[PDB]
């Protein structure tokens, strides 16, 4: 089961703020806000020049932790990326960005990814009409991701979909806040995203 | 060598010598203790490593190591062997798997329990 | 006795160039002459010419180098940095057009001998033929 | 004798047959002489039945004896339709 445990601690081990909570991570409290040092009894102690390896490990752990995906699944995507034509780095990101659970989150249907995930597992999500509770489901270009008719009235749904009014969204995505529909226009360009991650090191980590 | 020589003699392929010849290159092998001596290490170590001679089912009679803090092995304890040398005791190439057969698991063990065959203790 | 006249020529050239000779003779043979044509046209050697020495037919090979250099060791760069024999007596080497090698992403060459004559890897590739991969030069 | 019958491909609870020509004596999913079509029982695709009728007509011309089911499918593709 995708991690599930103290999360605003991973932010602390990566020395960078990851959004694994949506809000709370915006209001002075993602911990990174005054307490940016690693978790644990030695968190405040001076760090030692990390090994080329350490650097590469933490980088992958960053990107991977951002999407709350497992090593098993993360690796399988990367291997797929390698094989495919074109720059593995971007292509990899493109694939991570195509996970239904992620897209749900991108469209704002949920505040964080872990929430977006649950929304999927519980059928509150629809792809071209049909229900789909597979958070790893790969959204293709042209697919319409909406909210289940029966779920459109849920308290949590309104709140999030409300806050989405006026809010802009991914240049590769499009949100019709009305009927609570969204459309995966195209695979995001590396230029499209802006994750605190140097995918180049990630490729290197697996090249070892 | 010349190509003609290579055509004539060719290169010889490397053959691998097994380090755990306790036959059938099986993953483990069971046996019966014959002696449960204690032995002394080679320089620069000193201590009384626990060891046992095992009359193996592979038709072999080798000496295996008894890992962990204390054991319960005697002149007739049936045990399972796994292979793994004891760098300090020349001639000791296998370990005895604690937790299988007559080999009790280490008691009061709390960390590396898989090894030493120690069941998960209860937390009241 | 020379076991490989072509290898001999290739070396005579390799040797002369490492000490910056002007020319350098090599006992003449049509086949050697053929390779020199390529070498010349490709621009590795200024050019070559038939010459009689002691009554015997040779081939003056006029080598060429780069310009004098700066700092310690002003000795010019070699135009012919590398020149290695591939196919040899007792270990002959052939290639089909599809197996002709790409010597230094093209910045170099490979002289093969095809039934359509001695050609550079590019020339051969063009006429779509393969043959004995004689040497590589760069 | 030689026959025209279904060879089973696909997976568990997901059959996908192959209209094939083969010796009556060969194991069902063994080496066939020729593939002349395919058939999907659950018709999970609009293209669940195809049959190289020209070829089917060929083997029949030389002796291939079709299974009852094999015959059924051939008919659908108008193999015997002599209109």
């Amino acid at each position: 089961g995708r991690y599930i445990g103290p999360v605003c601690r991973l932010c602390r081990r990566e020395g960078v703020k990851l959004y694994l909570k949506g809000e709370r991570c915006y209001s002075p409290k993602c911990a990174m806000e005054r307490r940016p040092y690693p978790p644990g009894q030695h968190g405040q102690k001076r760090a030692r020049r990390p090994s080329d390896y350490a650097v590469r490990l933490r980088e992958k752990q960053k990107l991977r932790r951002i999407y709350g995906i497992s090593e098993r699944q993360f690796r399988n995507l990367f291997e797929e990326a390698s094989k495919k034509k074109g720059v593995t780095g971007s292509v990899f990101l493109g694939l991570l960005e195509s996970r239904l659970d992620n897209v749900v989150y991108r469209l704002g249907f949920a505040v964080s990814r872990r929430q977006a995930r649950q929304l999927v597992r519980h059928g509150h999500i629809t792809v071209n009409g049909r229900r789909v509770d597979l958070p790893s489901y790969r959204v293709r270009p042209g697919d319409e991701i909406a909210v289940a008719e029966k779920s459109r009235n849920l308290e949590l749904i309104r709140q999030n979909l409300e806050a989405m009014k006026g809010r802009k969204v991914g240049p590769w995505l499009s949100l019709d806040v009305e009927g609570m529909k969204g459309k995966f226009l195209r695979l995001p360009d590396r230029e499209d995203l802006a994750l605190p991650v140097n995918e180049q090191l990630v490729i290197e980590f697996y090249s070892r | 060598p010349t190509i003609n020589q290579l055509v004539r003699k060719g290169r010889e392929k490397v053959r691998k010598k097994s380090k755990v010849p306790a036959l059938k290159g099986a993953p483990f092998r069971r046996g019966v203790c014959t002696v449960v001596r204690t032995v002394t290490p080679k320089k620069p170590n000193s201590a009384l490593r626990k060891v046992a001679k095992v009359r193996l089912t592979s038709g072999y009679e080798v000496t295996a190591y008894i890992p962990g803090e204390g054991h319960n092995l005697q002149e007739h304890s049936v045990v399972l062997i796994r292979g793994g040398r004891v760098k300090d005791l020349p001639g000791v190439r296998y370990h005895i798997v604690r937790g299988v057969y007559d080999a009790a698991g280490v008691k009061d063990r709390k960390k590396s329990r898989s090894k030493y065959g120690t069941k998960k203790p209860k937390e009241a | 006795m020379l076991t490989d006249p072509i290898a001999d020529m290739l070396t005579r050239i390799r040797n002369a160039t490492r000490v910056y000779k002007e020319s350098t003779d090599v006992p003449a043979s049509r086949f050697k002459e053929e390779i020199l044509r390529i070498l010349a046209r490709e621009g590795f050697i200024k050019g070559y010419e038939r010459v009689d020495v002691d009554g015997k037919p040779y081939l003056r090979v006029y080598l060429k180098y780069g310009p004098r250099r700066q700092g310690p060791d002003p000795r010019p760069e070699q135009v012919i940095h590398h020149i290695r024999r591939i196919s040899k007596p007792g270990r002959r080497v052939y290639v089909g057009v599809k197996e002709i090698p790409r010597v230094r992403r093209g910045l170099g060459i490979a002289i093969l001998s095809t039934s359509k004559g001695v050609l550079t890897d590019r020339e051969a590739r063009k006429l779509g033929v393969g043959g004995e991969l004689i040497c590589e030069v760069w | 004798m030689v026959k025209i019958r279904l060879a089973r491909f696909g997976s568990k609870h997901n059959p996908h047959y192959r209209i094939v020509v083969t010796d009556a004596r060969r194991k069902r999913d063994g080496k066939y002489i020729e593939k002349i079509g395919y058939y999907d029982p659950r018709k999970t695709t609009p293209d669940w039945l195809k049959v190289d009728v020209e070829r089917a007509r060929y083997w029949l011309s030389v002796g291939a004896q079709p299974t009852d089911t094999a015959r059924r499918l051939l008919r659908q593709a108008g193999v015997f339709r002599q209109e």
Partner: protein
């Protein structure tokens, strides 16, 4: 097609049968070098026609006996014991390598 091989007659000591040495040439599967290799076929000569030293063609045929599965198709080049000689010598060297040895 019925395989046709060319070789040398290195034995006419049988009734209606000749031994034909056939050389083969090919690149070594790993080392490249073109290498030779030979094999002797017992060919059928019912007319006791061909003799020691002839270069005949041999053709794949209906078994004539055990060993014999080739018939002499024709003569390519008559007389030339140089080849036979080579074979005979190589065979004589054998008399050497063993428990004793033969003169070189």
């Amino acid at each position: 097609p019925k395989k046709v091989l060319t070789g040398v007659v290195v034995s006419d000591k049988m009734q209606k049968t000749v031994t034909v040495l056939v050389e083969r040439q090919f690149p070594h599967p790993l080392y490249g070098k073109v290498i030779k290799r030979s094999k002797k076929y017992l060919a059928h000569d019912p007319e006791e026609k061909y003799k020691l030293g002839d270069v005949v063609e041999i053709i794949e045929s209906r078994p004539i006996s055990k060993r014999k599965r080739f018939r002499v198709l024709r003569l390519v080049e008559s007389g030339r014991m140089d080849l036979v000689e080579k074979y005979l010598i190589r065979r004589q060297n054998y008399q050497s390598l063993s428990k004793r040895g033969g003169k070189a």
